[PDB]
Design a protein around this ligand. Structure first.
Ligand SMILES: [Mg+2]
Ligand SMILES: [Mg+2]
Ligand SMILES: [Mg+2]
Ligand SMILES: [Mg+2]
Ligand SMILES: [Mg+2]
Ligand SMILES: [Mg+2]
Ligand SMILES: [Mg+2]
Ligand SMILES: [Mg+2]
Ligand SMILES: [Mg+2]
Ligand SMILES: [Mg+2]
Ligand SMILES: [Mg+2]
Ligand SMILES: [Mg+2]
Ligand SMILES: [Mg+2]
Ligand SMILES: [Mg+2]
Ligand SMILES: [Mg+2]
Ligand SMILES: [Mg+2]
Ligand SMILES: [Mg+2]
Ligand SMILES: [Mg+2]
Ligand SMILES: [Mg+2]
Ligand SMILES: [Mg+2]
Ligand SMILES: [Mg+2]
Ligand SMILES: [Mg+2]
Ligand SMILES: [Mg+2]
Ligand SMILES: [Mg+2]
Ligand SMILES: [Mg+2]
Ligand SMILES: [Mg+2]
Ligand SMILES: [Mg+2]
Ligand SMILES: [Mg+2]
Ligand SMILES: [Mg+2]
Ligand SMILES: [Mg+2]
Ligand SMILES: [Mg+2]
Ligand SMILES: [Mg+2]
Ligand SMILES: [Mg+2]
Ligand SMILES: [Mg+2]
Ligand SMILES: [Mg+2]
Ligand SMILES: [Mg+2]
Ligand SMILES: [Mg+2]
Ligand SMILES: [Mg+2]
Lengths: 44, 272
RNA sequence: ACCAAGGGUUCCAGUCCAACGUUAAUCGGGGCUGGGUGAGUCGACCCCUAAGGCGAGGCCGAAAGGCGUAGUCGAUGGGAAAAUGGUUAAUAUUCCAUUACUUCUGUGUAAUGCGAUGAGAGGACGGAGAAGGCUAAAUCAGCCUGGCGUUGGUUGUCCAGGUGAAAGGAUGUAGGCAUGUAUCUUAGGCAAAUCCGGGGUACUCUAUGCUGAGAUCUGAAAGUGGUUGAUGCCAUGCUUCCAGGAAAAGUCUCUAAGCUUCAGUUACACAGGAAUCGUACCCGAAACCGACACAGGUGGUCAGGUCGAGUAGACCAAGGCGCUUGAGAGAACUCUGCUGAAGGAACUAGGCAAAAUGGUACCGUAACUUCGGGAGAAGGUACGCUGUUGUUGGUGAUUGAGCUGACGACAGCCGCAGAAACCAGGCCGCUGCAACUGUUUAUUAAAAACAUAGCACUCUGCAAACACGAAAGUGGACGUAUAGGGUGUGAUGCCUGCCCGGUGCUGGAAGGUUAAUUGAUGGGGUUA
RNA sequence: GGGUAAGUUCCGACCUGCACGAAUGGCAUAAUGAUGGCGGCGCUGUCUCCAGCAGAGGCUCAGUGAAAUCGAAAUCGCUG
RNA sequence: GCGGG
RNA sequence: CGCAACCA
C-alpha cells in the first residue's frame, strides 16, 4: 500500500517554511499566534 | 486527393487522408518559427475556461505575414509548406531584395510564381490590393476590417469572399456565412481562394486521432447528476427539459449576439 | 552489486547485559567509553534558461488586496577537465605510486587593429524501422606451473590452476554530409559591416571541404590464435510517416561608439593558483513511507555459465544467506498437496473448483464476410541415440586450410513412454446486447453504464459567441464560418412515417394594457 | 414445432403488442468482448461414496505471554 | 380600474 | 374575454 506522507524536503520548505509564512498576511498571523503561545519551534 | 486505408485493423477501416504531392518534405524556415506551449484551456486564475482541451503533439508557431506591407517589391514562391496551427497551407516567399516571409497560400499557387503588393500590383492570385482597386465580382481572401491591422476574414482552408460592389466609401462583400457586410475601401485583400479546400473530406477513423490534435472527450449532460448539469437526474434515460448549456443558456435557436456598436456595418443577415 | 530520494551515527574497536530483541543470549542496528568521512577532475554551489513564482514604475480595488511591464528567481534540461594498481578495524576516481588532463592569473619575448546592451550563425532537439562495420563480453585451442588419485583404470586423445593492463598521446581508415572557387554587384538584416542574405559572370563535379567508429604505434614462469558476439560505438547518422517534433547562455563571424602606439588581441617560455560545502552507513530495506526488527509500497543503473527465441524456465557462478522460540508425538478436525477400482456432471442456482489442451516442422481446414478476415478453425503425421553417405551459409592460414550455422536421405540400436523433467492454446453449435481498442464506483458493482470515429440541429462576422474574475484583465486564439461553442445520436448496411393544438424558440407590428417621470384640474388647513 | 426418457430455461414460428416503433433512433450486421442465456465433444473426487499417503497446525514438555466480555453466583431435567 | 363583445 | 391592481 502506498501511503499519504511521501516526504520531500524542498517541498516541505516551499509550502510551510519561514519565508513562505512571512510572505503573506495570514502567515504572519500564524507566526504571531505561535509566538504568543510560546512554541519552541516556529515552523517545520 | 483522398486516399482510403485497407481494413487490416478495426481502427484503420475508416481512415481517409488528404494527400498532396507538392508539399515540402523537410524542416521549416528557422528564422520564422517560434515556440508555442499548450494551455489545457486554463486562464490567469488557473481555472478551466474552455472545456475539451488538452494534450496533443508539440507544435511550433510559424510567424505568418498577414499585413503584407512590402509594396512594389516583387517576390517569388520558394515552396509550399504544411502548417500545424491552421487548416491552410503556407508559402515561403523570397523577395527580390533577399528577404524571406510566410503567407497564406492561394489555391493555384506553386513554387516559382510571382506575387506583389500595393495599389499598383497586377491582378493575379496572391496579390494584395486595397478594395478600392479590385474589379467588381472578384473572389478574395485575407480581408482586413481595420486599416493596417491585417487579414481577419476568410483565412481558413478553402474560404473566399465575393466583392459585390463599392458604393459611397464602402465596399459591399458577401461572406462564407452568407452574411452581407460592408468594409472600408482603404482595406486590403488578396485575390483568389485559400489553398487546401479538400480538408473537410478527411475522416479520422479512430478516437486517438482526435486526441492527437488536443481534443478531450465530451460528456453528455444527460449522463450526469442534477448537481452537475441541468440535464442530470432520472431513473433510466430521460430528457424532460428544453435543452440548455451547463450554465443554463438555451441551445436550440436562441440568439446570443448583443453588440450595438457594429449593427450598422451588417447589411443583410445570414438567415434572411 | 550500485546511485537518487528519505533517514541521521545505525559505521569501526573495546567493554557491560538491567530494560529493549515476540525464547536464552556470553550476541546485537541495545547501554557506556573512544575512534572514524581527506578532491582543480565525483556532486553541490556557480553561468543559462522551461513551466511556474515574485515583481520598481503601471492598471484595478470599501480597506485587506488582485493582476501585470522592465526585471529577478526557479531544473527535472544546456555549460571545463583522471585513469590503472596498493593501503585502514573503519575513507578513498579524494590518501600513496605511476602516467595525465582542464582552466585562470603574474613576469616576460615577437607580432598588430581591438572592440556591444546591436545584427547573423551555431547550440537546436519527433515516432518507427532496419542494413553494415566494429568493440566489450563469452568460449575453445596453444603456452607456463603443479598432479599421478583411500575402489577397476588413469605418463596421457589425462586432470587442475593461471595466462589477453586503463585513461591519455601520434597517425588517419571503414561510414556520413554539402558541388566548391576568384571577381563585379546589392529596394534586406532597429544604424554600420570586410560579415549573413539576394542577384551577374567565368572556372569545376575520380574537385573541393567538413565530420567520424575501429585497427596500428606509444603509454608497457607464461603472457599467443580461432569461433560466437551485443541492449554498447559509428549514430544528435540513414530510410520512412504524419499527429510536423523547448529555450537561453557558453561558443563563432561582423561592425557601432571608444581610446588610439597605450590599452586590448594571440603565439611561446618561465612562475604560481583552482576557494567553500557534501563524502561514514542503510537501498524490493531490521536504518526510507506503513504505530512494530510489520509477507505491503519505493525512481534509475549493472547483471556470468549449460540448454534456450528470450532479461521466460530448471540447475549453478561471483556474491550473499538458512528468514530471533524450540523439542517431541504422529488422535478427531482445519489448511496446502499427491494417487485412486467401476461409473463419468447423476453434483450444483450455475461444470464453481479441479482434471484436461499445450513445442517445432509439414499436410489439411466449414458456414458467413465489411474481402482484411473467420483461422492456430476443426483434424492429422514426424520427432531419441549410433553409423555411413549428400547438398548448401559465414570467416578465412598458405584458390582455399582450420572453426562454425541450416537442411536431406538411407542403415542400425534401446525403452511402457524420445516435445522426455521445468516450460507450454481446451475446442465446437444456436442466441440477446454493445460496432470495435479504450474508461469507471481507491476499499462488496468492470457492465448492456461512460467515451468513441461518423451523423444532425443550433449559436457565433471578431473588441466573436462562450467561460473565469469585484474590476483590471485572462482563456477561446497569436485561431477567423472547411473556424470556434452548446445539444442530441453513436462504426457500417437499408432507412428514418404523421401532428405546430400545449410549452419553448424565431419573425411581425396596426391595436389594447402597463413603470419611473410630468403635474391639468378639483377639495381641504391656516389669516388680512 | 425442435432438442431430452423427462425442458417454468433455450431456439423457430403464430399475433390475442395489459403497456414496441423509427437520431431519449427502428430493423440487421463480419470482426471483437475476464458480457447475459442454452446445447455438445474431451476430461475429470463435482458427484454415487469416500480411501490411503505427504507437509503445516491441533496435542504433550520447556520459555514468553494477549483478547472481547463480566450485578453477584453454592450456574441440572420435565411439566406448569 | 382600463378596454371589450 | 385579454392587460394591470389589497399587507383585516
Ligand atoms: Mg466541445
Ligand atoms: Mg449516473
Ligand atoms: Mg445514482
Ligand atoms: Mg440545478
Ligand atoms: Mg424509464
Ligand atoms: Mg555494527
Ligand atoms: Mg532476553
Ligand atoms: Mg551500539
Ligand atoms: Mg560556493
Ligand atoms: Mg505578479
Ligand atoms: Mg507597487
Ligand atoms: Mg536564475
Ligand atoms: Mg539537473
Ligand atoms: Mg565500507
Ligand atoms: Mg527517433
Ligand atoms: Mg587404484
Ligand atoms: Mg576520460
Ligand atoms: Mg561510501
Ligand atoms: Mg523477524
Ligand atoms: Mg519489510
Ligand atoms: Mg476415478
Ligand atoms: Mg480407471
Ligand atoms: Mg443436474
Ligand atoms: Mg440433484
Ligand atoms: Mg473453472
Ligand atoms: Mg490445473
Ligand atoms: Mg463494449
Ligand atoms: Mg481503476
Ligand atoms: Mg469497488
Ligand atoms: Mg471488482
Ligand atoms: Mg445512447
Ligand atoms: Mg447505427
Ligand atoms: Mg421522426
Ligand atoms: Mg439445466
Ligand atoms: Mg423505447
Ligand atoms: Mg425522437
Ligand atoms: Mg475491452
Ligand atoms: Mg507453554
Amino acid at each position: 500500500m502506498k501511503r499519504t506522507f511521501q516526504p520531500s524536503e524542498l517541498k516541505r520548505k516551499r509550502v510551510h517554511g519561514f519565508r513562505a509564512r512571512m510572505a503573506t498576511k495570514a502567515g504572519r498571523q500564524v507566526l504571531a499566534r505561535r509566538r504568543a503561545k510560546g512554541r519552541h519551534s516556529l515552523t517545520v | 486527393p483522398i486516399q482510403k486505408c485497407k481494413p487490416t485493423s478495426p481502427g484503420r477501416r475508416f481512415v481517409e487522408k488528404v494527400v498532396h504531392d507538392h508539399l515540402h518534405k523537410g524542416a521549416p524556415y528557422a528564422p520564422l518559427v517560434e515556440a508555442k506551449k499548450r494551455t489545457g484551456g486554463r486562464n490567469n486564475n488557473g481555472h478551466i475556461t474552455t472545456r475539451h482541451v488538452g494534450g496533443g503533439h508539440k507544435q511550433h508557431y510559424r510567424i505568418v505575414d498577414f499585413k503584407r506591407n512590402k509594396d512594389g517589391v516583387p517576390a517569388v514562391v520558394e515552396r509550399i509548406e504544411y502548417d500545424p496551427s491552421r487548416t491552410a497551407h503556407i508559402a515561403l516567399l523570397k523577395y527580390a531584395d533577399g528577404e524571406r516571409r510566410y503567407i497564406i497560400a492561394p489555391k493555384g499557387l506553386r513554387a516559382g510564381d510571382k506575387v506583389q503588393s500595393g495599389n499598383d500590383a497586377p491582378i493575379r492570385p496572391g496579390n494584395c490590393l486595397p478594395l478600392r482597386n479590385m474589379p467588381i465580382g472578384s473572389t478574395l481572401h485575407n480581408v482586413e476590417l481595420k486599416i493596417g491591422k491585417g487579414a481577419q476574414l476568410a483565412r481558413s482552408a478553402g474560404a473566399s469572399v465575393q466583392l459585390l460592389g463599392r458604393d459611397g466609401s464602402y465596399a459591399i462583400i458577401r461572406l462564407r456565412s452568407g452574411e452581407m457586410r460592408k468594409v472600408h475601401v482603404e482595406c486590403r485583400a488578396v485575390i483568389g481562394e485559400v489553398s487546401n479546400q479538400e480538408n473537410n473530406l478527411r475522416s479520422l477513423g479512430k478516437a486517438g486521432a482526435a486526441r492527437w490534435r488536443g481534443v478531450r472527450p465530451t460528456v453528455r449532460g444527460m449522463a450526469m447528476n442534477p448537481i452537475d448539469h441541468p440535464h442530470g437526474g432520472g431513473e433510466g434515460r430521460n430528457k424532460g427539459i428544453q435543452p440548455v448549456s451547463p450554465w443554463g443558456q438555451k441551445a436550440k435557436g436562441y440568439k446570443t449576439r448583443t453588440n450595438k456598436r457594429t449593427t450598422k456595418m451588417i447589411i443583410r443577415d445570414r438567415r434572411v
